[PDB]
Amino acid sequence: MQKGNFRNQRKTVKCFNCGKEGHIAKNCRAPRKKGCWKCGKEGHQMKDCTERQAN
Ligand SMILES: [Zn+2]
Ligand SMILES: [Zn+2]
């Protein structure tokens, strides 16, 4: 597998989203905000932003 996950997933590390040691933000089962600050779409992100120049 890719260089990143080795011990299942959970455990160790720390969640920089909630601040709970054991999991990561990417493994945060409790999302929030993460609202496109480009279009304002409080759901999708730039990686999922089909918008380029507003249009
Ligand atoms: Zn979390
Ligand atoms: Zn967007």
From Swiss-Prot:
Location relative to the cell: Virion
Zinc fingers typed CCHC-type, residue spans: 13-30, 34-51
PTM summary: Methylated by host PRMT6, impairing its function by reducing RNA annealing and the initiation of reverse transcription.
Function text: Encapsulates and protects viral dimeric unspliced genomic RNA (gRNA). Binds these RNAs through its zinc fingers. Acts as a nucleic acid chaperone which is involved in rearangement of nucleic acid secondary structure during gRNA retrotranscription. Also facilitates template switch leading to recombination. As part of the polyprotein, participates in gRNA dimerization, packaging, tRNA incorporation and virion assembly.
Protein name, per record: Nucleocapsid protein p7
Organism per entry: Human immunodeficiency virus type 1 group M subtype B (isolate YU-2)
Boundaries of the shown chain within the full protein: 378 to 432 of 1435
